[PDB]
Amino acid sequence: AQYEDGKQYTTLEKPVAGAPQVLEFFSFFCPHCYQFEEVLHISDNVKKKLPEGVKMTKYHVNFMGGDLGKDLTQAWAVAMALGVEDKVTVPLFEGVQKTQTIRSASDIRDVFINAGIKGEEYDAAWNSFVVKSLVAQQEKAAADVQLRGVPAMFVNGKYQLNPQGMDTSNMDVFVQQYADTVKYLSEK
Protein backbone atom coordinates (compact mmCIF):
# COMPACT_ATOMS: atom_id res chain seq x y z
CA ALA A 1 0.00 0.00 0.00
CA GLN A 2 1.04 3.65 0.25
CA TYR A 3 0.36 3.91 3.96
CA GLU A 4 1.63 0.82 5.80
CA ASP A 5 1.42 -0.15 9.43
CA GLY A 6 4.99 -0.03 10.73
CA LYS A 7 6.04 2.60 8.19
CA GLN A 8 4.38 6.01 8.55
CA TYR A 9 2.59 4.81 11.65
CA THR A 10 2.40 1.89 14.11
CA THR A 11 -0.73 0.31 15.60
CA LEU A 12 -1.30 0.05 19.34
CA GLU A 13 -1.35 -3.59 20.43
CA LYS A 14 -3.92 -2.53 22.94
CA PRO A 15 -6.09 0.45 21.88
CA VAL A 16 -7.33 3.16 24.19
CA ALA A 17 -11.11 3.55 24.31
CA GLY A 18 -12.58 7.05 24.57
CA ALA A 19 -9.24 8.70 23.73
CA PRO A 20 -9.09 12.23 22.21
CA GLN A 21 -9.27 12.21 18.42
CA VAL A 22 -5.88 13.74 17.76
CA LEU A 23 -3.62 13.45 20.81
CA GLU A 24 -0.16 15.00 20.95
CA PHE A 25 2.52 14.67 23.66
CA PHE A 26 5.52 16.90 24.19
CA SER A 27 8.02 18.24 26.73
CA PHE A 28 9.61 21.66 26.88
CA PHE A 29 12.88 19.75 27.48
CA CYS A 30 12.45 17.80 24.24
CA PRO A 31 14.68 18.95 21.38
CA HIS A 32 12.58 17.43 18.58
CA CYS A 33 9.56 19.04 20.26
CA TYR A 34 11.23 22.43 19.96
CA GLN A 35 11.73 21.80 16.26
CA PHE A 36 8.14 20.50 15.93
CA GLU A 37 6.86 23.70 17.48
CA GLU A 38 9.27 26.45 16.38
CA VAL A 39 10.54 25.27 13.01
CA LEU A 40 7.98 22.82 11.62
CA HIS A 41 4.70 24.03 13.16
CA ILE A 42 3.41 20.45 13.10
CA SER A 43 0.34 20.97 15.28
CA ASP A 44 -0.74 23.82 13.13
CA ASN A 45 -0.27 22.09 9.80
CA VAL A 46 -2.05 18.99 11.05
CA LYS A 47 -5.03 21.14 12.09
CA LYS A 48 -5.13 22.83 8.66
CA LYS A 49 -5.71 19.38 7.10
CA LEU A 50 -7.95 17.80 9.72
CA PRO A 51 -11.57 17.48 8.66
CA GLU A 52 -14.42 19.48 10.08
CA GLY A 53 -15.31 18.65 13.66
CA VAL A 54 -12.06 17.14 14.93
CA LYS A 55 -10.65 18.40 18.21
CA MET A 56 -6.94 18.60 18.75
CA THR A 57 -5.42 17.91 22.16
CA LYS A 58 -1.84 18.54 23.31
CA TYR A 59 -0.35 17.39 26.63
CA HIS A 60 2.96 17.85 28.50
CA VAL A 61 4.92 14.93 29.98
CA ASN A 62 6.80 14.36 33.24
CA PHE A 63 9.55 11.94 32.27
CA MET A 64 11.98 14.63 31.12
CA GLY A 65 13.70 17.22 33.27
CA GLY A 66 12.93 15.74 36.66
CA ASP A 67 11.46 18.18 39.15
CA LEU A 68 11.19 21.03 36.64
CA GLY A 69 9.56 18.66 34.17
CA LYS A 70 6.68 18.19 36.60
CA ASP A 71 6.52 21.93 37.24
CA LEU A 72 6.21 22.32 33.50
CA THR A 73 3.30 19.87 33.33
CA GLN A 74 1.41 21.77 36.02
CA ALA A 75 2.21 25.06 34.16
CA TRP A 76 0.89 23.62 30.93
CA ALA A 77 -2.23 22.70 32.95
CA VAL A 78 -2.43 26.37 34.01
CA ALA A 79 -1.96 27.41 30.37
CA MET A 80 -4.84 25.11 29.27
CA ALA A 81 -7.19 26.28 32.01
CA LEU A 82 -6.58 29.96 31.21
CA GLY A 83 -6.52 29.38 27.46
CA VAL A 84 -3.09 30.93 27.00
CA GLU A 85 -1.24 28.09 25.29
CA ASP A 86 -0.47 30.32 22.31
CA LYS A 87 1.18 33.00 24.39
CA VAL A 88 3.50 30.88 26.51
CA THR A 89 4.53 27.98 24.28
CA VAL A 90 7.31 29.82 22.50
CA PRO A 91 8.86 31.58 25.54
CA LEU A 92 8.75 28.33 27.52
CA PHE A 93 10.64 26.43 24.81
CA GLU A 94 13.17 29.18 24.41
CA GLY A 95 13.45 29.69 28.17
CA VAL A 96 14.25 26.02 28.65
CA GLN A 97 16.33 25.18 25.57
CA LYS A 98 17.59 28.41 24.00
CA THR A 99 18.38 30.96 26.70
CA GLN A 100 18.33 28.55 29.65
CA THR A 101 16.75 31.10 31.94
CA ILE A 102 14.14 28.68 33.27
CA ARG A 103 15.46 26.82 36.34
CA SER A 104 12.65 26.98 38.84
CA ALA A 105 8.89 27.21 39.13
CA SER A 106 9.35 30.93 39.75
CA ASP A 107 11.10 31.36 36.38
CA ILE A 108 8.22 29.52 34.71
CA ARG A 109 5.83 31.91 36.40
CA ASP A 110 7.84 34.90 35.02
CA VAL A 111 7.14 33.76 31.47
CA PHE A 112 3.39 33.93 32.17
CA ILE A 113 3.71 37.36 33.88
CA ASN A 114 5.70 38.68 30.95
CA ALA A 115 3.06 37.20 28.61
CA GLY A 116 0.54 39.33 30.49
CA ILE A 117 -1.26 36.86 32.74
CA LYS A 118 -1.70 38.53 36.11
CA GLY A 119 0.27 37.16 39.05
CA GLU A 120 -2.81 36.72 41.13
CA GLU A 121 -4.57 34.92 38.26
CA TYR A 122 -1.63 32.60 37.67
CA ASP A 123 -1.13 31.69 41.33
CA ALA A 124 -4.84 31.07 41.72
CA ALA A 125 -4.89 28.73 38.71
CA TRP A 126 -1.58 27.07 39.78
CA ASN A 127 -3.15 26.07 43.07
CA SER A 128 -6.65 25.24 41.79
CA PHE A 129 -8.27 21.79 41.87
CA VAL A 130 -9.31 22.33 38.25
CA VAL A 131 -5.59 22.45 37.41
CA LYS A 132 -4.91 19.39 39.60
CA SER A 133 -7.36 17.34 37.57
CA LEU A 134 -5.92 18.71 34.32
CA VAL A 135 -2.52 17.45 35.53
CA ALA A 136 -4.19 14.09 36.30
CA GLN A 137 -5.60 14.02 32.77
CA GLN A 138 -2.21 14.66 31.20
CA GLU A 139 -0.66 11.86 33.19
CA LYS A 140 -3.52 9.46 32.61
CA ALA A 141 -3.43 9.91 28.84
CA ALA A 142 0.34 9.32 28.75
CA ALA A 143 -0.06 6.34 31.05
CA ASP A 144 -2.80 4.83 28.84
CA VAL A 145 -0.52 4.61 25.77
CA GLN A 146 2.77 3.29 27.23
CA LEU A 147 4.46 6.61 26.62
CA ARG A 148 8.29 6.63 26.88
CA GLY A 149 9.04 9.10 24.12
CA VAL A 150 8.13 12.51 22.82
CA PRO A 151 7.22 14.07 20.46
CA ALA A 152 4.37 11.63 19.98
CA MET A 153 1.01 11.78 18.31
CA PHE A 154 -1.85 9.30 18.58
CA VAL A 155 -4.98 9.14 16.47
CA ASN A 156 -8.27 7.88 17.91
CA GLY A 157 -6.39 6.00 20.60
CA LYS A 158 -5.26 3.41 18.09
CA TYR A 159 -2.60 4.78 15.76
CA GLN A 160 0.79 6.30 16.56
CA LEU A 161 2.65 8.50 14.08
CA ASN A 162 6.04 7.17 13.05
CA PRO A 163 8.06 10.18 11.78
CA GLN A 164 11.22 8.05 11.62
CA GLY A 165 9.70 6.47 8.50
CA MET A 166 9.17 9.72 6.47
CA ASP A 167 11.86 11.81 4.65
CA THR A 168 13.67 14.70 6.32
CA SER A 169 15.58 15.98 3.30
CA ASN A 170 12.96 18.69 2.91
CA MET A 171 11.35 20.20 5.97
CA ASP A 172 8.14 21.24 4.22
CA VAL A 173 7.71 17.84 2.61
CA PHE A 174 8.23 16.18 5.98
CA VAL A 175 5.43 18.25 7.52
CA GLN A 176 2.96 17.62 4.68
CA GLN A 177 3.63 13.91 4.76
CA TYR A 178 3.17 14.00 8.50
CA ALA A 179 -0.10 15.94 8.30
CA ASP A 180 -1.49 13.80 5.46
CA THR A 181 -0.71 10.74 7.52
CA VAL A 182 -2.75 12.10 10.40
CA LYS A 183 -5.64 12.85 7.99
CA TYR A 184 -5.46 9.36 6.48
CA LEU A 185 -5.42 7.81 9.97
CA SER A 186 -8.27 10.10 10.93
CA GLU A 187 -10.54 8.84 8.12
CA LYS A 188 -9.78 5.19 8.77
Side-chain angles (χ1 to χ4, degrees):
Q2 290 284 344
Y3 291 103
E4 281 176 349
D5 191 338
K7 196 174 70 220
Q8 297 105 321
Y9 67 102
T10 54
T11 303
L12 298 174
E13 318 227 321
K14 117 172 51 194
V16 176
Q21 285 170 288
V22 182
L23 180 59
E24 199 174 332
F25 292 99
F26 82 108
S27 164
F28 285 114
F29 280 94
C30 158
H32 285 138
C33 301
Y34 189 108
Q35 294 293 313
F36 264 43
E37 171 63 23
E38 302 276 277
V39 180
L40 301 177
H41 305 282
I42 291 289
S43 297
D44 177 63
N45 280 283
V46 169
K47 179 158 127 154
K48 304 202 276 80
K49 281 192 169 167
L50 292 175
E52 42 186 59
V54 141
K55 93 177 312 294
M56 215 150 160
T57 309
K58 172 138 74 184
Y59 290 159
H60 197 268
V61 299
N62 288 343
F63 61 82
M64 296 190 82
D67 210 88
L68 250 193
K70 285 204 83 166
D71 278 325
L72 283 167
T73 304
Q74 190 164 349
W76 186 249
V78 173
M80 283 185 294
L82 296 182
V84 292
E85 297 95 321
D86 290 349
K87 309 188 189 189
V88 295
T89 293
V90 166
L92 285 169
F93 266 117
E94 298 193 351
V96 176
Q97 301 185 49
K98 191 184 177 187
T99 54
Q100 284 178 5
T101 44
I102 297 179
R103 313 206 223 75
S104 67
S106 174
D107 299 336
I108 296 170
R109 182 170 183 279
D110 288 344
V111 169
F112 284 72
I113 304 294
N114 185 51
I117 291 83
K118 290 164 189 176
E120 164 42 48
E121 192 186 359
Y122 182 86
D123 302 338
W126 179 269
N127 288 304
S128 72
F129 282 90
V130 171
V131 154
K132 280 189 194 315
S133 57
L134 272 181
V135 166
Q137 286 169 234
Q138 291 182 92
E139 301 184 9
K140 177 184 187 283
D144 285 340
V145 292
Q146 333 334 325
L147 193 66
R148 131 186 74 256
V150 287
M153 190 179 283
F154 295 89
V155 180
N156 291 314
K158 304 159 214 147
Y159 304 107
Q160 177 180 1
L161 278 285
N162 180 41
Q164 314 152 11
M166 311 175 185
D167 193 343
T168 54
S169 70
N170 184 286
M171 308 200 92
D172 299 306
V173 170
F174 169 72
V175 174
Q176 291 327 311
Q177 178 174 8
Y178 194 103
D180 291 344
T181 301
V182 175
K183 186 184 188 284
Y184 158 78
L185 289 176
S186 195
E187 285 153 9
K188 218 167 166 84

